[PDB]
Amino acid sequence: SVPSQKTYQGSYGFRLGFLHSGTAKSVTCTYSPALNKLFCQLAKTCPVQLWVDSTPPPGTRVRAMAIYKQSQHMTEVVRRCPHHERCSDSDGLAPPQHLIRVEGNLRAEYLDDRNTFRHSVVVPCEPPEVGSDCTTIHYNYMCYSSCMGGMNRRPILTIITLEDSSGNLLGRDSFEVRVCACPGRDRRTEEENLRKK
Numbered sequence: 526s527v528p529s530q531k532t533y534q535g536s537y538g539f540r541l542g543f544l545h546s547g548t549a550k551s552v553t554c555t556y557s558p559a560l561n562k563l564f565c566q567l568a569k570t571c572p573v574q575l576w577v578d579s580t581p582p583p584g585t586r587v588r589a590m591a592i593y594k595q596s597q598h599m600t601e602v603v604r605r606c607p608h609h610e611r612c613s614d615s616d617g618l619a620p621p622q623h624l625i626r627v628e629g630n631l632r633a634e635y636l637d638d639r640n641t642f643r644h645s646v647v648v649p650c651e652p653p654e655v656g657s658d659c660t661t662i663h664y665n666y667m668c669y670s671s672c673m674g675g676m677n678r679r680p681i682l683t684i685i686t687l688e689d690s691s692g693n694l695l696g697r698d699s700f701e702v703r704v705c706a707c708p709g710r711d712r713r714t715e716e717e718n719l720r721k722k
């Protein structure tokens with residue numbers, strides 16, 4: 526009915542990381558630690574770091590799924606709006622209905638859940654690159670938060686789950702997302718609203 530959003534590092538110490546992109550008017554993606562909220566432009570690269578304390582088993586995967594943040598909307602499937610699901614901006618792999626895409630990974634798989642009808646995109650863990658300390662996945666959000674007939678100004682969360690080869694839970698993290706024209710301005714505004722309040 527409703528996916529859990531409880532943060533869970535699990536045995537491998539799984540958690541997300543975000544770049545420090547700032548809040549200039551020109552910024553296309555920016556993360557607010559105080560709000561735990563990502564602000565991004567439509568269909569632009571959102572780099573999300575995946576951190577672990579130890580390497581999970583071969584066959585481990587990382588899934589992304591959106592849900593509505595407000596409880597009274599949480600049972601509604603988050604999907605692209607009636608305009609964007611029809612605008613033929615297919616990358617050849619993502620179904621046109623899916624809000625969240627993975628960029629530049631030919632091993633990405635897109636799931637329409639047969640029971641819940643929710644959408645998700647999942648990628649397989651690969652051996653850690655030599656010299657690096659984390660891995661980065663690049664997501665795209667394919668509707669504005671404001672899209673009528675879709676998210677319709679309702680806030681969403683992205684839930685990132687670390688899964689074993691059967692789909693069982695190994696780890697979980699999450700963040701709010703606003704897809705908007707001016708992420709820098711909106712992050713500054715919402716952080717100011719938080720400070721005042």
Ligand SMILES: Nc1cc(C(F)(F)F)cc(Br)c1N
Nearest residue numbers: 575576577650651652653660
């Ligand atoms: N090496 C690696 C580690 C992780 C983890 F989520 F475990 F951090 C996710 C991915 Br995708 C890769 N490729």
Ligand SMILES: [Zn+2]
Nearest residue numbers: 606609668672
């Ligand atoms: Zn839309």
